[PDB]
DNA sequence: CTTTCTCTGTTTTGTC
DNA sequence: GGACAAAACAGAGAAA
DNA sequence: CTTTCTCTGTTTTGTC
DNA sequence: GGACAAAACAGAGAAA
């Protein structure tokens, strides 16, 4: 009985594997009764992933990181870089411009940060402009 | 009432956090309720992971790739090469010693392969070996 | 331990 | 209040 | 598309 | 048959 697939049928009721979701416009189908059923409850299917997600609609945002494209560009001129995620880009355009948008509010400390994740572990170990 | 922290009590039943597991010998104590209440569930509570597993067991297995120490060397002279995985460390040994231990058991192809995935690869494409 | 920078799951903000 | 999508955050974490 | 090689969640094997 | 840990697999996937 055990085998690689569910294509020749059991003694159940009307299988022949699964395809489609729908979940209010989720236009991605798995090829798998196994693969949808996680799907449809916010799991990533494929294999070494098995991660929960908080938003459906995330799962299919989700499915970029899995896919080897990397649609967004740098726009500067000599610059080949490449990403998958808006906030990358963002963030890394900085690097040219040199720009350092985030300042610590707290008014001893006057310090400025060009990357957000360096600003939240200043106020998070200092304490600055927290509570 | 939305506040950073559980440490403040409601208004429900014996609360301060949380701390240790057992789960029939995991000496691991998260520092939340809601972490310790997905890692029983074996879903690991890290920040950016969320990975649902099969072995509850593998859970504190898994942790390593959060730990940003490789235990395991490779023995040749000269090569620096590290792991955190067993596996990794034996095919990359291979490359040393020049192995090729996976042979297609099919009895017009002869090819040998130095690493399992290749040799998976060309069992699932050309139906080698299989069945 | 440091600094610099990218990745990505969830939260916040902006527009209707 | 509600969508819903765009942007930003808040960690994780790789590289030097 | 290729080849070469590492990572890691689950399965298989080996020892008791 | 049952532990349980060690090894191996089977993908994913990064690098060239
Ligand atoms: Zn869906
Ligand atoms: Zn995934
Ligand atoms: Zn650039
Ligand atoms: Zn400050
Ligand atoms: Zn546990
Ligand atoms: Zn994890
Ligand atoms: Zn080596
Ligand atoms: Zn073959």
């Given at each position: 009985?055990?085998?690689?697939?569910?294509?020749?049928?059991?003694n159940?009721?009307?299988?022949?594997?699964?395809?489609?979701?729908?979940?209010?416009?989720?236009t991605?189908?798995?090829?798998?009764?196994?693969?949808?059923?996680?799907?449809?409850?916010?799991?990533?299917?494929?294999?070494?992933?098995?991660?929960?997600?908080?938003?459906?609609?995330?799962?299919?945002?989700?499915?970029?990181?899995?896919?080897?494209?990397?649609?967004?560009?740098?726009?500067?001129?000599?610059?080949?870089?490449?990403?998958?995620?808006?906030?990358?880009?963002?963030?890394?355009?900085?690097?040219?411009?040199?720009?350092?948008?985030?300042?610590?509010?707290?008014?001893?400390?006057?310090?400025?940060?060009?990357?957000?994740?360096?600003?939240?572990?200043?106020?998070?170990?200092?304490?600055?402009?927290?509570?």
């Open positions: 009985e055990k085998e690689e697939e569910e294509e020749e049928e059991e159940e009721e009307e299988e022949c594997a699964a395809y489609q979701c729908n979940m209010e416009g989720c991605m189908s798995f090829s798998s009764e196994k693969q949808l059923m996680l799907h449809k409850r916010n799991i990533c299917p494929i294999k070494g992933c098995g991660k929960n997600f908080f938003s459906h609609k995330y799962l299919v945002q989700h499915q970029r990181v899995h896919s080897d494209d990397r649609p967004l560009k740098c726009p500067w001129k000599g610059c080949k870089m490449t990403f998958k995620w808006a906030w990358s880009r963002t963030e890394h355009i900085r690097v040219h411009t040199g720009a350092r948008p985030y300042v610590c509010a707290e008014p001893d400390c006057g310090q400025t940060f060009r990357f957000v994740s360096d600003f939240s572990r200043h106020k998070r170990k200092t304490g600055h402009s927290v509570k």
